[PDB]
PDB file of C-alpha atoms and ligand atoms in Angstrom:
ATOM      1  CA  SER A 209     -16.232 -28.076 -27.501  1.00  0.00           C
ATOM      2  CA  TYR A 210     -13.536 -26.302 -25.395  1.00  0.00           C
ATOM      3  CA  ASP A 211     -15.673 -24.084 -23.025  1.00  0.00           C
ATOM      4  CA  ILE A 212     -13.809 -24.273 -19.635  1.00  0.00           C
ATOM      5  CA  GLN A 213     -16.980 -22.921 -17.847  1.00  0.00           C
ATOM      6  CA  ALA A 214     -19.643 -25.164 -19.417  1.00  0.00           C
ATOM      7  CA  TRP A 215     -19.545 -27.823 -16.614  1.00  0.00           C
ATOM      8  CA  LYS A 216     -21.347 -25.487 -14.173  1.00  0.00           C
ATOM      9  CA  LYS A 217     -24.740 -25.229 -15.967  1.00  0.00           C
ATOM     10  CA  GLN A 218     -24.332 -28.924 -17.024  1.00  0.00           C
ATOM     11  CA  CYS A 219     -24.083 -29.806 -13.276  1.00  0.00           C
ATOM     12  CA  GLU A 220     -27.043 -27.516 -12.413  1.00  0.00           C
ATOM     13  CA  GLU A 221     -29.217 -29.370 -15.005  1.00  0.00           C
ATOM     14  CA  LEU A 222     -28.103 -32.830 -13.760  1.00  0.00           C
ATOM     15  CA  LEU A 223     -28.924 -31.822 -10.126  1.00  0.00           C
ATOM     16  CA  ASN A 224     -32.422 -30.669 -11.325  1.00  0.00           C
ATOM     17  CA  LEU A 225     -32.880 -34.157 -12.916  1.00  0.00           C
ATOM     18  CA  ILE A 226     -31.736 -35.871  -9.674  1.00  0.00           C
ATOM     19  CA  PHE A 227     -34.188 -33.750  -7.583  1.00  0.00           C
ATOM     20  CA  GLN A 228     -36.994 -34.953 -10.050  1.00  0.00           C
ATOM     21  CA  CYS A 229     -36.024 -38.647  -9.376  1.00  0.00           C
ATOM     22  CA  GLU A 230     -38.155 -40.275  -6.633  1.00  0.00           C
ATOM     23  CA  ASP A 231     -34.940 -42.227  -5.684  1.00  0.00           C
ATOM     24  CA  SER A 232     -33.330 -38.918  -4.437  1.00  0.00           C
ATOM     25  CA  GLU A 233     -35.787 -38.061  -1.598  1.00  0.00           C
ATOM     26  CA  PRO A 234     -33.718 -39.679   1.248  1.00  0.00           C
ATOM     27  CA  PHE A 235     -30.467 -37.899   0.115  1.00  0.00           C
ATOM     28  CA  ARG A 236     -31.957 -34.401  -0.707  1.00  0.00           C
ATOM     29  CA  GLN A 237     -31.532 -32.953   2.851  1.00  0.00           C
ATOM     30  CA  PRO A 238     -28.844 -33.343   5.548  1.00  0.00           C
ATOM     31  CA  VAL A 239     -29.612 -36.569   7.540  1.00  0.00           C
ATOM     32  CA  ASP A 240     -31.768 -35.780  10.640  1.00  0.00           C
ATOM     33  CA  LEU A 241     -30.111 -37.115  13.861  1.00  0.00           C
ATOM     34  CA  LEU A 242     -33.422 -37.379  15.833  1.00  0.00           C
ATOM     35  CA  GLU A 243     -34.330 -40.469  13.725  1.00  0.00           C
ATOM     36  CA  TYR A 244     -30.546 -41.372  13.536  1.00  0.00           C
ATOM     37  CA  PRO A 245     -28.864 -40.064  16.768  1.00  0.00           C
ATOM     38  CA  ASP A 246     -25.807 -42.428  16.276  1.00  0.00           C
ATOM     39  CA  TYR A 247     -25.102 -41.049  12.717  1.00  0.00           C
ATOM     40  CA  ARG A 248     -21.988 -38.920  13.601  1.00  0.00           C
ATOM     41  CA  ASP A 249     -20.329 -41.997  15.288  1.00  0.00           C
ATOM     42  CA  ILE A 250     -20.610 -43.920  11.920  1.00  0.00           C
ATOM     43  CA  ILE A 251     -20.317 -41.067   9.323  1.00  0.00           C
ATOM     44  CA  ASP A 252     -17.471 -38.483   9.643  1.00  0.00           C
ATOM     45  CA  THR A 253     -18.625 -36.109   6.802  1.00  0.00           C
ATOM     46  CA  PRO A 254     -22.387 -35.782   6.142  1.00  0.00           C
ATOM     47  CA  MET A 255     -23.345 -34.771   2.562  1.00  0.00           C
ATOM     48  CA  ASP A 256     -26.660 -34.276   0.743  1.00  0.00           C
ATOM     49  CA  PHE A 257     -27.846 -32.866  -2.652  1.00  0.00           C
ATOM     50  CA  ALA A 258     -29.058 -29.521  -1.184  1.00  0.00           C
ATOM     51  CA  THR A 259     -25.511 -28.933   0.207  1.00  0.00           C
ATOM     52  CA  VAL A 260     -24.046 -29.787  -3.245  1.00  0.00           C
ATOM     53  CA  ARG A 261     -26.470 -27.373  -5.076  1.00  0.00           C
ATOM     54  CA  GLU A 262     -25.804 -24.599  -2.566  1.00  0.00           C
ATOM     55  CA  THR A 263     -21.958 -25.071  -2.877  1.00  0.00           C
ATOM     56  CA  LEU A 264     -22.244 -24.904  -6.699  1.00  0.00           C
ATOM     57  CA  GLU A 265     -24.537 -21.798  -6.662  1.00  0.00           C
ATOM     58  CA  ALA A 266     -22.204 -20.086  -4.130  1.00  0.00           C
ATOM     59  CA  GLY A 267     -19.297 -20.351  -6.608  1.00  0.00           C
ATOM     60  CA  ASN A 268     -17.436 -22.690  -4.178  1.00  0.00           C
ATOM     61  CA  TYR A 269     -16.628 -25.500  -6.635  1.00  0.00           C
ATOM     62  CA  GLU A 270     -13.581 -24.881  -8.911  1.00  0.00           C
ATOM     63  CA  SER A 271     -14.178 -28.035 -11.081  1.00  0.00           C
ATOM     64  CA  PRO A 272     -16.763 -30.736 -11.793  1.00  0.00           C
ATOM     65  CA  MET A 273     -14.307 -33.226 -10.126  1.00  0.00           C
ATOM     66  CA  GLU A 274     -14.858 -31.492  -6.741  1.00  0.00           C
ATOM     67  CA  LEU A 275     -18.700 -31.707  -7.192  1.00  0.00           C
ATOM     68  CA  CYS A 276     -18.376 -35.418  -8.229  1.00  0.00           C
ATOM     69  CA  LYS A 277     -16.306 -36.130  -5.038  1.00  0.00           C
ATOM     70  CA  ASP A 278     -19.174 -34.607  -2.880  1.00  0.00           C
ATOM     71  CA  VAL A 279     -21.915 -36.549  -4.747  1.00  0.00           C
ATOM     72  CA  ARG A 280     -19.932 -39.804  -4.435  1.00  0.00           C
ATOM     73  CA  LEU A 281     -19.654 -39.067  -0.633  1.00  0.00           C
ATOM     74  CA  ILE A 282     -23.529 -39.027  -0.435  1.00  0.00           C
ATOM     75  CA  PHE A 283     -23.459 -42.620  -1.857  1.00  0.00           C
ATOM     76  CA  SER A 284     -20.434 -43.893   0.186  1.00  0.00           C
ATOM     77  CA  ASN A 285     -22.122 -42.373   3.322  1.00  0.00           C
ATOM     78  CA  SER A 286     -25.342 -44.273   2.352  1.00  0.00           C
ATOM     79  CA  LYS A 287     -23.291 -47.518   1.883  1.00  0.00           C
ATOM     80  CA  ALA A 288     -21.567 -46.971   5.311  1.00  0.00           C
ATOM     81  CA  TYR A 289     -24.902 -46.731   7.279  1.00  0.00           C
ATOM     82  CA  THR A 290     -26.941 -49.603   5.627  1.00  0.00           C
ATOM     83  CA  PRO A 291     -27.145 -52.710   7.893  1.00  0.00           C
ATOM     84  CA  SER A 292     -28.396 -54.737   4.847  1.00  0.00           C
ATOM     85  CA  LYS A 293     -27.234 -54.629   1.167  1.00  0.00           C
ATOM     86  CA  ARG A 294     -31.026 -55.302   0.656  1.00  0.00           C
ATOM     87  CA  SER A 295     -32.075 -52.021   2.422  1.00  0.00           C
ATOM     88  CA  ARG A 296     -34.756 -50.023   0.495  1.00  0.00           C
ATOM     89  CA  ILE A 297     -32.789 -46.711   0.938  1.00  0.00           C
ATOM     90  CA  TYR A 298     -29.436 -48.416   0.007  1.00  0.00           C
ATOM     91  CA  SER A 299     -31.173 -49.782  -3.184  1.00  0.00           C
ATOM     92  CA  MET A 300     -32.473 -46.192  -3.868  1.00  0.00           C
ATOM     93  CA  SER A 301     -28.819 -44.926  -3.543  1.00  0.00           C
ATOM     94  CA  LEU A 302     -27.440 -47.610  -5.960  1.00  0.00           C
ATOM     95  CA  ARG A 303     -29.991 -46.670  -8.704  1.00  0.00           C
ATOM     96  CA  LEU A 304     -29.391 -42.891  -8.262  1.00  0.00           C
ATOM     97  CA  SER A 305     -25.588 -43.534  -8.285  1.00  0.00           C
ATOM     98  CA  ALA A 306     -25.892 -45.426 -11.647  1.00  0.00           C
ATOM     99  CA  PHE A 307     -27.998 -42.523 -13.082  1.00  0.00           C
ATOM    100  CA  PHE A 308     -25.499 -39.941 -11.795  1.00  0.00           C
ATOM    101  CA  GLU A 309     -22.364 -41.805 -13.150  1.00  0.00           C
ATOM    102  CA  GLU A 310     -24.110 -42.263 -16.575  1.00  0.00           C
ATOM    103  CA  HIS A 311     -24.610 -38.454 -16.840  1.00  0.00           C
ATOM    104  CA  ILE A 312     -21.452 -37.006 -15.146  1.00  0.00           C
ATOM    105  CA  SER A 313     -18.975 -38.929 -17.427  1.00  0.00           C
ATOM    106  CA  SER A 314     -19.425 -36.526 -20.429  1.00  0.00           C
ATOM    107  CA  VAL A 315     -19.243 -33.478 -18.095  1.00  0.00           C
ATOM    108  CA  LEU A 316     -15.825 -34.591 -16.686  1.00  0.00           C
ATOM    109  CA  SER A 317     -14.532 -35.643 -20.157  1.00  0.00           C
ATOM    110  CA  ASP A 318     -15.562 -32.292 -21.777  1.00  0.00           C
ATOM    111  CA  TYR A 319     -14.047 -30.248 -18.907  1.00  0.00           C
ATOM    112  CA  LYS A 320     -10.665 -32.105 -18.857  1.00  0.00           C
ATOM    113  CA  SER A 321     -10.540 -31.801 -22.714  1.00  0.00           C
ATOM    114  CA  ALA A 322     -11.216 -27.996 -22.463  1.00  0.00           C
ATOM    115  CA  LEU A 323      -8.423 -27.516 -19.899  1.00  0.00           C
ATOM    116  CA  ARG A 324      -5.916 -29.550 -22.042  1.00  0.00           C
ATOM    117  CA  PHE A 325      -6.844 -27.359 -25.067  1.00  0.00           C
ATOM    118  CA  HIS A 326      -6.292 -24.205 -22.932  1.00  0.00           C
ATOM    119  CA  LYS A 327      -2.689 -25.446 -22.152  1.00  0.00           C
ATOM    120  CA  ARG A 328      -2.009 -26.768 -25.720  1.00  0.00           C
ATOM    121  CA  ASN A 329       0.716 -24.042 -26.342  1.00  0.00           C
TER     122      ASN A 329
HETATM  123  C1  LIG B 548     -28.820 -41.586   3.741  1.00  0.00           C
HETATM  124  C2  LIG B 548     -29.143 -42.906   4.347  1.00  0.00           C
HETATM  125  N1  LIG B 548     -28.771 -44.020   3.816  1.00  0.00           N
HETATM  126  C3  LIG B 548     -29.337 -45.073   4.594  1.00  0.00           C
HETATM  127  C4  LIG B 548     -29.226 -46.430   4.362  1.00  0.00           C
HETATM  128  C5  LIG B 548     -29.847 -47.299   5.241  1.00  0.00           C
HETATM  129  C6  LIG B 548     -30.572 -46.832   6.337  1.00  0.00           C
HETATM  130  C7  LIG B 548     -31.230 -47.841   7.240  1.00  0.00           C
HETATM  131  O1  LIG B 548     -32.186 -48.489   6.813  1.00  0.00           O
HETATM  132  N2  LIG B 548     -30.743 -48.003   8.486  1.00  0.00           N
HETATM  133  C8  LIG B 548     -31.419 -48.753   9.546  1.00  0.00           C
HETATM  134  C9  LIG B 548     -31.375 -47.996  10.858  1.00  0.00           C
HETATM  135  N3  LIG B 548     -30.002 -47.715  11.273  1.00  0.00           N
HETATM  136  C10 LIG B 548     -29.720 -47.284  12.513  1.00  0.00           C
HETATM  137  O2  LIG B 548     -29.079 -46.252  12.700  1.00  0.00           O
HETATM  138  N4  LIG B 548     -29.978 -48.119  13.472  1.00  0.00           N
HETATM  139  C11 LIG B 548     -28.960 -48.895  14.219  1.00  0.00           C
HETATM  140  C12 LIG B 548     -29.469 -50.315  14.416  1.00  0.00           C
HETATM  141  C13 LIG B 548     -27.698 -48.949  13.388  1.00  0.00           C
HETATM  142  C14 LIG B 548     -28.687 -48.200  15.544  1.00  0.00           C
HETATM  143  C15 LIG B 548     -29.001 -47.930  10.234  1.00  0.00           C
HETATM  144  C16 LIG B 548     -29.487 -47.383   8.907  1.00  0.00           C
HETATM  145  C17 LIG B 548     -30.678 -45.452   6.559  1.00  0.00           C
HETATM  146  C18 LIG B 548     -30.062 -44.578   5.677  1.00  0.00           C
HETATM  147  C19 LIG B 548     -29.963 -43.068   5.618  1.00  0.00           C
HETATM  148  C20 LIG B 548     -29.199 -42.504   6.832  1.00  0.00           C
HETATM  149  C21 LIG B 548     -31.351 -42.408   5.462  1.00  0.00           C
END
């Protein structure tokens, strides 16, 4: 399975699954600062799933590693803002992160394999 391009639709389908998860709702849109006016003192680089889907559809990711870095930022940014490791939203982020890591592993493996095969000779 050496298709160098296959990651892109694979990542589109996984983002569709994440948007279907109730656990995604808080992380779907860029954080609103009216409810959280201190956010940009705590979080240097805001990220959300709509930004990730738009970046993908724009043709502005070169690899599934770059998309994975952005998605992991959504979860590190969630971990950075939680006052309690027993926060509802933080707990939502931990479950969605486990779901995401479970599904992205084959995408990364298949892509890195395809690129090694491309440079075999
Ligand atoms: C994505 C996210 N992930 C999490 C995780 C936890 C919370 C959360 O429950 N809190 C309480 C309220 N906070 C506040 O800013 N208040 C202070 C007292 C610090 C001033 C801190 C975050 C909010 C979010 C969002 C931004 C939606």
